[PDB]
Amino acid sequence: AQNPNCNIMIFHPTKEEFNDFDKYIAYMESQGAHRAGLAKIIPPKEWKARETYDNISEILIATPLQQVASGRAGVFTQYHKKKKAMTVGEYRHLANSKKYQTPPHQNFEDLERKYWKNRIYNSPIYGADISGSLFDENTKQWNLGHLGTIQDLLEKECGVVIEGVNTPYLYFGMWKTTFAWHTEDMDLYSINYLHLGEPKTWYVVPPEHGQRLERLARELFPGSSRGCGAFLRHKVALISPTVLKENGIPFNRITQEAGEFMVTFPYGYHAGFNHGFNCAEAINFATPRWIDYGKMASQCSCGEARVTFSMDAFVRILQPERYDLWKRGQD
Numbered sequence: 001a002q003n004p005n006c007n008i009m010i011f012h013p014t015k016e017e018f019n020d021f022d023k024y025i026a027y028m029e030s031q032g033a034h035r036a037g038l039a040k041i042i043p044p045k046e047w048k049a050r051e052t053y054d055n056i057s058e059i060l061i062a063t064p065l066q067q068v069a070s071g072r073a074g075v076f077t078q079y080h081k082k083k084k085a086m087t088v089g090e091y092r093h094l095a096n097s098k099k100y101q102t103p104p105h106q107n108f109e110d111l112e113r114k115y116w117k118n119r120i121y122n123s124p125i126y127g128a129d130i131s132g133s134l135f136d137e138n139t140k141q142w143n144l145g146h147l148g149t150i151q152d153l154l155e156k157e158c159g160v161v162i163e164g165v166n167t168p169y170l171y172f173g174m175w176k177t178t179f180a181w182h183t184e185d186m187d188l189y190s191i192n193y194l195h196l197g198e199p200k201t202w203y204v205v206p207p208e209h210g211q212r213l214e215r216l217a218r219e220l221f222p223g224s225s226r227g228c229g230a231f232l233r234h235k236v237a238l239i240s241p242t243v244l245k246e247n248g249i250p251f252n253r254i255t256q257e258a259g260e261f262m263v264t265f266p267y268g269y270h271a272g273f274n275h276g277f278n279c280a281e282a283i284n285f286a287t288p289r290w291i292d293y294g295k296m297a298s299q300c301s302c303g304e305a306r307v308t309f310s311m312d313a314f315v316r317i318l319q320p321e322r323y324d325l326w327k328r329g330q331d
């Protein structure tokens with residue numbers, strides 16, 4: 001069995017290897033990459049996502065989210081308070097202000113220490129989940145707006161034609177902006193490209209151990225667990241590496257820098273934080289190996305998780321027994 005310790009693997013494809021996206025994902029899996037739940041892909045030196053980032057300041061963040069924490073430093077939830085719209089140029093200036101800017105620090109480890117010590121005492125503002133793309137249309141390799149769609153993969157594997165679309169999303173971050181512990185919708189893959197700015201630190205639980213994280217979360221967030229049998233789908237709970245280690249949960253960590261891709265694999269729980277002003281682009285995708293994960297994915301039916309239009313068909317076709325209850329939670 002390849003990668004039996006479930007380490008995060010880092011790949012350096014050549015420009016030739018970068019041509020066929022599906023083929024390279026299958027290659028990484030042949031080497032055991034999926035066992036970690038996360039992999040890093042460093043593009044060949046010849047590749048670029050677009051020519052420059054000099055002209056992005058006029059993008060609108062219609063609903064910036066202030067991420068307000070409750071709990072203790074290593075075990076907390078966050079709620080998202082909606083803020084007035086602002087442009088990327090206005091958001092960048094805000095991220096760089098004295099109130100929000102990255103503190104002085106020695107290295108990524110020191111910054112990570114400071115994040116876990118101090119996150120809860122601040123409320124950073126995240127421009128998340130913005131439909132759009134920063135890849136140039138002429139970028140043919142690993143262009144996250146030009147991937148094969150999940151609806152086409154389901155149709156190719158299973159023969160059923162379904163409605164829905166699959167488009168990318170932009171994320172504008174600042175120091176301490178936080179992504180809570182989650183797997184993807186329908187335990188899909190994700191791919192995330194850090195277009196510019198400061199790094200993103202990731203934490204990940206191997207898919208084979210995801211239920212260990214779920215059981216800890218039920219212990220740590222007991223009211224939330226009684227409210228919903230899949231409350232991690234709400235994407236609000238944080239647990240620090242120190243607490244994970246105290247409770248014996250297997251995990252790994254890595255820092256993504258600008259110009260790098262990350263892939264999350266089906267049922268790979270992940271969480272993390274931004275180091276400073278940045279912009280990422282991410283999208284869900286599927287492969288044949290996902291289908292079985294999609295069939296088994298948990299679902300929130302309490303009403304909190306509310307998701308996209310296109311998840312309807314995935315539930316309806318892969319999980320017909322769960323469909324009626326889940327759809328009630330959507331409505």
Ligand SMILES: O=C(O)CNC(=O)C(=O)O
Nearest residue numbers: 171179190191192280282
């Ligand atoms: O970058 C973020 O805030 C969150 N991204 C992801 O969870 C992802 O790409 O799957």
Ligand SMILES: [Mg+2]
Nearest residue numbers: 056057058059
């Ligand atoms: Mg612009």
Ligand code: NI
Nearest residue numbers: 183184190264
């Ligand atoms: Ni994710």
Ligand SMILES: [Zn+2]
Nearest residue numbers: 228300302304
């Ligand atoms: Zn729920």
